[PDB]
């Protein structure tokens, strides 16, 4: 008897499914929008990417079989840093690089039997897409959500551009993990995402997303209970407002500090102090914010010779000015609480100011004297009637009391900052603004979009050196002012890649509209995304930014939903066994040579055998005569451990790779790509083929029609097992439990073998085989389709999903 042979059959079915257009989505649709995170065309796709993309294909096929109108699209996140950094690293022009990579990625997807509605392809670096970036940008400008501001920004010296706060990961560039970001002062474009902070927080509650992602976004947004508190100045009319995120500490405010630039600094200075204060104010203004944000620097300040009354204690406190208080934040004035704020602690110690404890540490009380500030939550003490209150609650109680007594007011604030979107890079969407010497910043009219990127041909011209490459090109930026008609300069910064990806899932609903980003009728018919699949690395990047874009476009009236992704599933990383290099072992201790340690990215030069085990590593004898330390590491280019699709499917096959992926572990978990997994996939597919091949002749002479209620013995038993299997596989598919679905098919395959020991090929067996192939199709579609055609005329796409007999489960 012949054996399963994936060669030839896969190419045959791949072409068939595409020709037939089974995965073409209707312009207006039950619907299911199954979305996977579209890739940066920055390199070869490997099995890691293909775990994400096979997962979407499984669900898309399953839903399509059930009768849903299914939208399952693909496209290219082709602008900004990832495409351009990759092209530039290999001295290639971005456009050439991007389209070569797209061609390769398409083939990788096709060869795995993944099916998209390719009629909905988007390529974000094309003006047919980026013109709509520009349109959205103009609407944001119009609605008070896009602005230019001077201030401190994060700078990647390798990218040679500013980055958004979200693109800084443990102090490093999201793209250059070895490179600490630096601070610069620059005038840049921002999207006012903080205008949506409360909605972004509150609207997480209804969401079928992993709790870890919700927690990351909650922490990132970082809502806090704050207050403005008024301090009356002794002998004066003015009451100084201070902004505080610790209103619970008010009874411990022992002095006030005003920014040097605060109008009251010179206004309140005693006559004899004025000279000294003015000199200090002038010295401060000679510094940069960075310089005033510097630490380890001398603590400086001047006492103004003025006092304020603490509104809680009714006690007189001195008013100082000091460099460390910045004029542009809060009210430009602070209450200093040396017992609980370390900056104030060090200042008070230097200048001999009182330190007063008002938050007690739970467990062991704070010592006397206090040697450093106590900055964590505790129990209010020396705080009059608030004594004993847990301090976070006490914030709310002090705010209520302030408001009641006319002494201040609650002010809610957020850790979240506005989104720095402009980039000093060529390969990105031009910002649709003009700078006129007379009018200021003026928008490009909607009717002139796109503002086309100029076609720079020389890679060395494009290479970013600190300024936008477009600054070298007056043929692009020299223009006329739309407002007054005089000479003006186009903005020369471009939009970050995350602009593009914040609405692509809407473009897929209307991919060729040349009058709007999309028609709301079409978007609203397909939205929200029923199931989104992609990596947790986007938790506060794309998965936050997209929610902002959707709420904005909703507020413009263009989108009915306020949440773009109703379900989000974060897939764990595919890892590969990776050689980190030689080690030496003596007893229980493994010595790591420097190059081995550095590749592992760990501080230890010595690990115990137990440490090696616990990190998932092992020691393997090498030909070089040493033991090498091997460990699973995330599949990626940087580790040189990618399993690429072309070579693998040529040597083995697509269904083999699909089963390897899908069976390895729960999809939310990490998995290791292994030879054992590949062999297990072969064993299963071979066993399916063998069972059906063994019975092919008998199956051809058997009808599938029977009456379930007349079955007896093993026939009745098989019918029950069949429906148990169907229930389990269907529910697992709905839940993305893909590995246990496959386990259920493996177990039912065993049942089919066991059945055939006692029973011949019967009508019920034929129906079981039919149903088996239908249930197999989302997972191993090529084999399923191959065997289906041995007995039945049309595609598995046309066969439907089998109907569950609930009575069979009793
Ligand atoms: N213009 C300014 N320059 C320098 N520092 C300023 C400031 N305005 C306020 N602050 C300080 O930073 C906290 C958060 O404010 P932002 O959210 O950063 O603006 C505020 O709450 B806090 O007030 C009392 C207190 C007690 C404590 F145990 C810890 C902290 C504070 O000090 C204020
Ligand atoms: C933002 C947007 C939505 C997205 C972007 N574009 C991204 O991210 O792209 S990339 N990077 O290309 O990616 C895509 C996807 O895929 C995945 N992955 C990768 N790698 C891997 C492994 N190794 N495993 C698993 N998975 C994976 C990611 O995550 C995403 O989702
Ligand atoms: Zn960088
Ligand atoms: Zn003008």
- The Cα–Cα gap between 382 and 251 comes to 7
- 3-class DSSP assignment, residue 82: helix
Identify whether the C-beta of residue 649 lies closer than 8 Å to the C-beta of residue 50: no
Q: How far is CA 523 from CA 56, 130, 510, in A?
A: 20, 18, 7
SS3 content of the chain, % helix, strand, coil (to 5): 40, 20, 40
User: Which contacts of 609-617 are long-range, i.e. CB under 8 A and separated by 24 or more positions?
Assistant: 609/585, 617/580
Residues contacting 100, CB < 8 A, separation 6+? none
- The Cα–Cα gap between 616 and 600 comes to 12
* Backbone dihedral angles phi then psi of residue 15, each to the nearest 5 degrees: -65, -45
- The Cα–Cα gap between 447 and 449 comes to 6
The strand pairing partners of 149, in sequence order, are: 188
CB-neighbour burial class of residue 722 (10 A; exposed 0-12, middle 13-18, buried 19+): buried
Instruction: Dump the DSSP string for 33-97.
Output: EEEE-PPP-SS--BHHHHHHHHHHHHHHHHHHHHT-EEE----B--SSHHHHHHHHHTT--HHHH
Strand 316-321 relative to strand 333-336: parallel, antiparallel, unpaired?
unpaired
Beta strands in 142-204 (DSSP E): 146-156, 161-163, 168-169, 172-173, 182-191
| Residue with tokens 């938050």, as numbered in its chain | 359
CB-neighbour burial class of residue 311 (10 A; exposed 0-12, middle 13-18, buried 19+): buried
DSSP 46: B
Please report which helix (H) or strand (E) contains residue 232, including its range: strand 223-232
- 3-class DSSP assignment, residue 18: helix
Nearest to 285 by CA among 311, 305, 266: 266
Instruction: Dump the DSSP string for 728-755.
Output: HHHHHHHTT-HHHHHHHHHHHHHHHHHH
Identify whether the C-beta of residue 289 lies closer than 8 Å to the C-beta of residue 152: yes
* 263 token code pair: 């109008």
- The Cα–Cα gap between 508 and 297 comes to 53
- 3-class DSSP assignment, residue 632: strand
Residues contacting 155, CB < 8 A, separation 6+? 161, 162, 163, 181, 182, 183, 184
Alpha helices in 556-710 (DSSP H): 594-600, 609-614, 645-651, 654-663, 675-694, 696-700
CB atoms closer than 10 angstroms to residue 599? 17
Residues contacting 583, CB < 8 A, separation 6+? 590, 591, 592, 593, 596, 619, 626, 627, 628, 629
Answer whether 339 contacts ligand 1 (Cβ < 6 A): no
- The Cα–Cα gap between 348 and 352 comes to 5
Does 7 sit behind a cis peptide bond, omega within 30 degrees of 0 on the bond before it?
no
- 3-class DSSP assignment, residue 287: coil
Can you list the domains of the chain with their CATH numbers?
30-219+414-575+633-643 (3.40.50.620), 224-413 (3.90.740.10), 576-632 (2.30.210.10), 652-810 (1.10.730.10)
Nearest to 495 by CA among 168, 135, 151: 135
Q: How far is CA 551 from CA 268, 434, 540, 557, in A?
A: 46, 27, 16, 10
For residue 244, report the distance from its CA to the centre of ligand 1, in Å.
5
- The Cα–Cα gap between 53 and 568 comes to 14
CB-facing half-sphere around the CA of 236: CA atoms within 13 A: 18
**Four-CA torsion 549, 570, 654, 803, nearest 10 degrees:** -90
For residue 101, report the distance from its CA to the centre of ligand 3, in Å.
21
Identify whether the C-beta of residue 653 lies closer than 8 Å to the C-beta of residue 686: no
CA triple 656-529-191, angle to 5 deg: 120
Chain centroid, CA 765 distance in Å: 47
Identify whether the C-beta of residue 565 lies closer than 8 Å to the C-beta of residue 529: yes
CA triple 567-573-578, angle to 5 deg: 175
Nearest to 654 by CA among 168, 5, 1, 122: 5
- 3-class DSSP assignment, residue 68: coil
CB atoms closer than 10 angstroms to residue 366? 17
| 125 annotated as a binding-site residue | no
Q: How far is CA 180 from CA 122, 167, 168, 496, 617, in A?
A: 34, 12, 9, 19, 29
CA triple 349-354-357, angle to 5 deg: 100
Please give the biggest Cα pair distance in the chain: 112
* Backbone dihedral angles phi then psi of residue 630, each to the nearest 5 degrees: -110, 145
Identify whether the C-beta of residue 195 lies closer than 8 Å to the C-beta of residue 207: no
Instruction: Dump the DSSP string for 417-482.
Output: --EE-EES-SSSEEP-EEEETTTEEEEPPGGG---PPP----HHHHS-SSS-GGGG-HHHHEEE-T
Residues contacting 751, CB < 8 A, separation 6+? 718, 721, 725
* 675 token code pair: 């030879």
484: left (phi over 0), alpha (psi -120 to 50) or beta: alpha
User: Which contacts of 444-447 are long-range, i.e. CB under 8 A and separated by 24 or more positions?
Assistant: 444/134, 444/138, 444/482, 445/482, 446/135, 446/138
| Residue with tokens 């595609």, as numbered in its chain | 795
CB atoms closer than 10 angstroms to residue 30? 9
Sign, CA torsion 692/694/695/698: positive
| Residue with tokens 């040529």, as numbered in its chain | 650
Does 450 sit behind a cis peptide bond, omega within 30 degrees of 0 on the bond before it?
yes
Q: How was this structure determined?
A: X-ray
- The Cα–Cα gap between 761 and 82 comes to 57
Answer whether 574 contacts ligand 1 (Cβ < 6 A): no
* Backbone dihedral angles phi then psi of residue 345, each to the nearest 5 degrees: -55, -55
Answer whether 77 contacts ligand 2 (Cβ < 6 A): yes
- The Cα–Cα gap between 110 and 569 comes to 23
- The Cα–Cα gap between 753 and 408 comes to 78
* 694 token code pair: 């063994």
* Backbone dihedral angles phi then psi of residue 433, each to the nearest 5 degrees: -130, 155
Answer whether 335 contacts ligand 1 (Cβ < 6 A): yes
Nearest to 657 by CA among 12, 113, 11, 18: 113
DSSP 290: H
Answer whether 535 contacts ligand 2 (Cβ < 6 A): yes
Report the chain's terminal Cα–Cα distance, integer Å: 39
What angle do helix axes 713-734 and 763-776 make, rounded to 10 degrees?
10
Q: How far is CA 373 from CA 229, 298, 299, in A?
A: 22, 19, 16
Sign, CA torsion 154/156/162/168: negative
- The Cα–Cα gap between 287 and 289 comes to 7
Answer whether 534 contacts ligand 2 (Cβ < 6 A): yes
Ligand 1 atom closest to Cα of 336? 24
CB atoms closer than 10 angstroms to residue 337? 27
Ligand 2 atom closest to Cα of 537? 29
Chain centroid, CA 568 distance in Å: 11
CB atoms closer than 10 angstroms to residue 484? 13
| Protein residue with least CA distance to atom 12, ligand 1 | 244
Please report which helix (H) or strand (E) contains residue 673, including its range: strand 671-673
- The Cα–Cα gap between 365 and 297 comes to 32
Residues contacting 745, CB < 8 A, separation 6+? 725, 729, 772, 775, 776, 779
The strand pairing partners of 70, in sequence order, are: 32
- The Cα–Cα gap between 441 and 444 comes to 10
Please report which helix (H) or strand (E) contains residue 36, including its range: strand 31-36
| 435 annotated as a binding-site residue | no
Nearest to 187 by CA among 453, 493, 499: 493
- The Cα–Cα gap between 389 and 378 comes to 8
Instruction: Dump the DSSP string for 507-567.
Output: HTTSTT-SSSS--HHHHHHHPSBSEEE--GGGTTTHHHHHHHHHHHHHHTTS-S-S-SBSB
Give the resolution to one decimal, in Å: 1.9
Alpha helices in 352-419 (DSSP H): 391-405
- The Cα–Cα gap between 163 and 181 comes to 9
Chain centroid, CA 232 distance in Å: 47
* 274 token code pair: 């004025």
Q: How far is CA 564 from CA 35, 195, 209, 716, in A?
A: 11, 18, 12, 47
Residue numbers preceding breaks in the chain (C to N > 2.5 A): 29
CB atoms closer than 10 angstroms to residue 542? 20
Residues contacting 330, CB < 8 A, separation 6+? 242, 243
* 48 token code pair: 């890691």
Nearest to 242 by CA among 313, 332, 175, 164: 332
| 340 annotated as a binding-site residue | no
Nearest to 164 by CA among 441, 418, 372, 446: 418
| Residue with tokens 């000679």, as numbered in its chain | 286
For residue 239, report the distance from its CA to the centre of ligand 1, in Å.
18
CA triple 186-188-189, angle to 5 deg: 170
Answer whether 243 contacts ligand 1 (Cβ < 6 A): yes
Answer whether 227 contacts ligand 1 (Cβ < 6 A): no
DSSP 569: E
- The Cα–Cα gap between 767 and 775 comes to 12
Identify whether the C-beta of residue 652 lies closer than 8 Å to the C-beta of residue 678: yes
For residue 459, report the distance from its CA to the centre of ligand 2, in Å.
27
Identify whether the C-beta of residue 310 lies closer than 8 Å to the C-beta of residue 253: yes
Nearest to 775 by CA among 726, 732, 731: 726
Pocket test for ligand 1, best of 334, 395, 402 (most atoms within 8 A of CB): 334
Residues contacting 147, CB < 8 A, separation 6+? 189, 190, 192, 418
CB-neighbour burial class of residue 479 (10 A; exposed 0-12, middle 13-18, buried 19+): middle
Answer whether 341 contacts ligand 2 (Cβ < 6 A): no
Identify whether the C-beta of residue 699 lies closer than 8 Å to the C-beta of residue 769: yes
- The Cα–Cα gap between 262 and 46 comes to 58
- The Cα–Cα gap between 385 and 393 comes to 14
* 663 token code pair: 């069976």
- The Cα–Cα gap between 569 and 573 comes to 13
* 741 token code pair: 């679905």
Identify whether the C-beta of residue 69 lies closer than 8 Å to the C-beta of residue 596: no
Which ligand number lies closest to the CA of residue 482? 4
* 668 token code pair: 């939310």
395: left (phi over 0), alpha (psi -120 to 50) or beta: alpha
Residues contacting 165, CB < 8 A, separation 6+? 154, 417, 419, 420
Instruction: Dump the DSSP string for 119-159.
Output: GG--BTTSHHHHHHHHHHHHHHHHTT-EEEEEEEEEEETTT
| 176 annotated as a binding-site residue | yes
Pocket test for ligand 2, best of 122, 123, 534 (most atoms within 8 A of CB): 534
Instruction: Dump the DSSP string for 328-341.
Output: TSTTSEEEE-TTT-
Identify whether the C-beta of residue 430 lies closer than 8 Å to the C-beta of residue 452: yes
* 501 token code pair: 């990806």
Answer whether 244 contacts ligand 1 (Cβ < 6 A): yes
Residues contacting 387, CB < 8 A, separation 6+? 380, 381
- The Cα–Cα gap between 572 and 673 comes to 12
Identify whether the C-beta of residue 657 lies closer than 8 Å to the C-beta of residue 648: yes
Identify whether the C-beta of residue 571 lies closer than 8 Å to the C-beta of residue 535: yes
């Amino acid at each position: 008897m012949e054996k399963y042979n994936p060669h030839a059959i896969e190419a045959k079915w791949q072409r068939f499914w595409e020709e037939k257009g089974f995965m073409k989505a209707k312009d207006l649709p039950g619907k299911q929008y199954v979305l996977v995170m579209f890739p940066y065309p920055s390199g070869d796709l490997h099995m890691g990417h293909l775990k994400n993309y096979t997962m979407g294909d499984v669900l898309a096929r399953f839903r399509r079989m059930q009768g849903y109108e299914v939208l399952h699209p693909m496209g290219w996140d082709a602008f900004g840093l990832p495409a351009e950094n990759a092209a530039l690293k290999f001295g290639v022009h971005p456009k050439d690089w991007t389209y070569a990579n797209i061609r390769q990625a398409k083939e990788s997807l096709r060869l795995m039997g993944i099916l998209y509605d390719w009629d909905r392809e988007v390529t974000t670096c094309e003006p047919e897409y980026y013109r709509w970036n520009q349109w959205i940008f103009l609407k944001m400008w119009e609605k008070g959500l896009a602005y230019r501001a001077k201030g401190l920004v994060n700078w990647c010296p390798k990218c040679q551009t500013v980055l958004a706060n979200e693109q800084v990961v443990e102090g490093r560039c999201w793209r250059h993990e070895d490179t600490p970001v630096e601070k610069r002062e620059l005038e840049q474009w921002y999207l006012r995402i903080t205008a949506y902070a409360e909605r972004l927080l509150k609207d997480l509650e209804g969401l079928n997303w992993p709790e870890k992602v919700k927690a990351m976004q909650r922490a990132w947004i970082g809502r806090s209970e704050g207050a403005e508190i008024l301090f009356p100045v002794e002998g004066k009319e003015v009451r100084i407002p201070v902004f505080t995120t610790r209103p619970d500490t008010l009874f411990g405010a022992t002095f006030l500090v005003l920014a040097p630039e605060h109008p009251l600094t010179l206004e309140l200075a005693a006559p004899e102090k004025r000279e000294e204060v003015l000199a200090y104010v002038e010295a401060a203004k000679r510094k940069t914010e960075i310089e005033r944000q510097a630490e380890g620097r001398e603590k400086t300040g001047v006492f103004l010779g003025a006092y304020a009354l603490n509104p809680a204690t009714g006690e007189r406190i001195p008013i100082w000015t000091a460099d460390y208080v910045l004029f542009g934040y809060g009210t430009g004035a602070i209450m200093a609480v040396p017992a609980h704020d370390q900056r104030d602690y060090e200042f008070a110690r230097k200048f001999g100011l009182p330190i007063k404890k008002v938050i007690e540490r739970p467990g062991e009380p704070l010592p006397e004297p206090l040697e450093r500030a106590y900055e964590e939550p505790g129990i209010m003490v020396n705080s009059g009637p608030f004594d004993g209150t847990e301090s976070e609650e006490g914030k709310r109680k002090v705010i209520a009391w302030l408001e009641e007594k006319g002494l201040g007011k609650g002010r809610v604030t957020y850790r979240l900052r506005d989104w720095l979107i402009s980039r000093q890079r060529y390969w990105g969407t031009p910002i649709p603004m003009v700078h006129c010497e007379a009018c200021g910043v003026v928008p490009v009219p909607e009717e002139e979009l796109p503002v086309l990127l100029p076609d720079l041909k020389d890679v060395e011209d494009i290479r970013p050196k600190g300024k936008s490459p477009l600054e070298a090109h007056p043929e692009f930026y020299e223009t006329t002012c739309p407002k007054c008609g005089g000479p003006a300069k186009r903005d020369t910064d471009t939009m970050d890649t995350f602009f593009d990806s914040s609405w692509y899932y809407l473009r897929y609903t209307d991919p060729h509209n040349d009058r709007l980003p999309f028609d709301p009728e079409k978007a609203n018919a397909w939205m929200p995304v029923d199931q989104y699949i992609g990596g947790v690395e986007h938790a506060v990047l794309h998965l936050l930014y997209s929610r902002f874009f959707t709420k904005f476009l909703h507020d413009l009236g263009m989108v009915k939903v306020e949440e773009p992704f109703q379900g989000l599933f974060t897939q764990g990383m595919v890892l590969a066994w990776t050689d980190f290099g030689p080690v030496e072992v003596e007893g229980s201790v493994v010595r790591l040579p420097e190059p081995t340690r550095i590749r592992l990215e760990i501080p230890e030069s010595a690990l115990s055998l137990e440490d090696v085990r616990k990190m998932g590593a092992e020691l393997r004898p090498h030909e070089d005569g040493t033991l090498h330390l091997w460990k699973p590491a995330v599949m990626s280019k940087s580790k040189g451990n990618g399993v690429m699709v072309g070579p693998f499917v040529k040597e083995q096959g697509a269904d083999i790779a699909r089963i390897t992926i899908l069976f390895a572990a729960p999809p939310e978990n990490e998995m290791v790509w292994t030879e054992e997994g590949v062999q297990g996939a072969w064993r299963f597919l071979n066993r399916i083929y063998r069972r059906v091949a063994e019975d092919r002749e008998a199956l051809l002479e058997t009808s599938g029609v029977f009456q379930a209620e007349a079955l007896e013995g093993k026939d009745r038993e098989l019918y029950g097992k069949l429906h148990e299997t169907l229930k389990k596989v269907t529910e697992d598919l709905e839940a993305l439990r893909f590995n246990t679905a496959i386990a259920a098919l493996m177990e039912f395959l065993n049942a089919l073998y066991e059945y055939r020991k006692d029973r011949p090929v019967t009508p019920v067996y034929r129906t079981a085989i039919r149903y088996y192939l239908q249930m197999l199709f989302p997972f191993a579609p090529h084999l399923a389709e191959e065997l289906w055609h041995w007995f039945w005329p049309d595609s598995l796409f046309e066969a439907g999903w089998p109907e569950l007999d609930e009575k069979a489960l009793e």
